[PDB]
Amino acid sequence: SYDRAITVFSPDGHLFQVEYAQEAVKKGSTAVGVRGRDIVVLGVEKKSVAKLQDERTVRKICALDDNVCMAFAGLTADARIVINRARVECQSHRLTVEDPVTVEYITRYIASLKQRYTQSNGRRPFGISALIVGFDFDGTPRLYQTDPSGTYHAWKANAIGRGAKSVREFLEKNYTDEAIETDDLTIKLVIKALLEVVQSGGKNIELAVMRRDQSLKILNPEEIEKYVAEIEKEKEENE
Amino acid sequence: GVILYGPPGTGKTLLAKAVANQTSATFLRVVGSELIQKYLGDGPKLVRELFRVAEEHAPSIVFIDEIDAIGTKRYDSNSGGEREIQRTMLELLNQLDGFDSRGDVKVIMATNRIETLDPALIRPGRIDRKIEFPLPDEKTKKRIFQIHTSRMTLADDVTLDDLIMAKDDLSGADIKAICTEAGLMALRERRMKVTNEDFKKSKENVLYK
């Protein structure tokens, strides 16, 4: 057994292996999510496809239950083992207390798994950040995120990945109340958001909405070809 | 102080020429590899007389390029080992923020391995501005092809947008490395315009080896 303290304090009060892992998040591909009052909409950008690969084994939006979706950034090898440990826990909740898992509960499991893992012996911390999105019982759509140090944190709109400060500055000057008016109008905010990011001009973006009673339903590159037309068409006439 | 860092071939040396184009100051350049000497103490003597030259002329600009090379590569000419590299850097650490009256001397530095060198040299007071250079973005890439193919009689066969995403992280240096090479293939056949198959065999020659 390898017993060595990896994460230790700095002489001024930092945890260096934590904040080095935050920079591995800061060059993964961008993931943006907002919530509507009835339909949540989150979609990663930079699919970065090379037209010789299977398109389904590269997906970064998975589901933990029927109601809880999840996107991430950072490095993918650490991601899909946190996900598989979350799938066991949200299934073991049902053998216990009968209701399906509330979206706040599954964030506390991931965040507490991630903290104690910056505390044990001989373990580097995880290098991912996540967005947990779900519409729980009694239909209240909400989302969260998870820092690699393990601080779960709710939001109304957020973005992580490479180029996340510029998108977060873009949303606050754009997030109104009437932006979440229609289920097709909230999507026009996300498609306007990631187009203000690394280019992804309809060819590298994959939105995925959830209408509070469905599962995840990814629109194929025909409505995004339709939406990016009309989002740029309104931009064509006003300016 | 101003330092410039980033991956190799992104335009660190390219930007310093634009400053020396523009300025009316006297402009001094030295490479970091030639700071190390074969005799003992000839290193720190060379630094002291550099800033003597820079101060005695004018408002002046001292450009020191590739300063990570003072600490990475060990050479058998240097009789003092790593503890002659060290004594030179202590003199360089003096000449940026000594107690002497400095005068009007601006210092520009550039490297591509920013994590290797001494953090005492990058403290505020010696270098204030720290400028990162990223890789060229794919809409800034198209601008670079517009520059290096400006004054060439480019035939209308070619499509530049296929050339852009060829390497996913091709630097600005690679673009000039292709555009200069494709012109060299045309002079093998005495032609005046550059066709598409020039570029098709160009990236095989430049990138893939």
Binding site: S1, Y2, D3, R4 | -
Partner: protein
Amino acid sequence: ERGYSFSLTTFSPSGKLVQIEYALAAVAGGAPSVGIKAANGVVLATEKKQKSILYDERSVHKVEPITKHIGLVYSGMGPDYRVLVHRARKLAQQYYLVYQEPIPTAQLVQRVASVMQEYTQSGGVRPFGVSLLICGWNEGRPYLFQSDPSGAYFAWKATAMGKNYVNGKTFLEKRYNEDLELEDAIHTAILTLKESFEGQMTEDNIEVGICNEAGFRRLTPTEVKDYLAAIA
């Protein structure tokens, strides 16, 4: 007590495992040894010089049998060899207690080289400093395999290990063909060990072991003197 539980063998920034590259230097400074298979059996021949006249040459042996039909020589350092001999003696028994059959020579090298790879990754250990040559005649056809401290293995027709191994491989390439008997391969194994020995190659400076379909055995110095006679 306890161990270290961390690998002291890491990747270089040039992408090379440096400790394995150093272990091959200790193999190359060993005693020279050649091995030749030819169409009815395998010949293993090594070079054993005592440092002085005080040593008892009939006490230790370079050529060792593993079972009825598998022999094994080395070229490296001494005390590492006796460890993985006693390991390979045991591995041939757990195959036999399960299957009631002598082990194939291929499946032994599957399991001996798995020990050497496991030993260059685990915590707190330096790799072995020996390379092996393994013979045997399973199901008529003979076999000749060579392992290395990294844990790989090969299937040679004829090869040399030890000092001046790059000269022996050029010598065997100009000598070996498909069609030889066992007594011809003995004569050309002495002819390639004479490239690097001293002036006197007596009946006790070398050590030769053979396989047949009758099984592995090791030559006594009586007939080794007869093979050393009328040689070169």
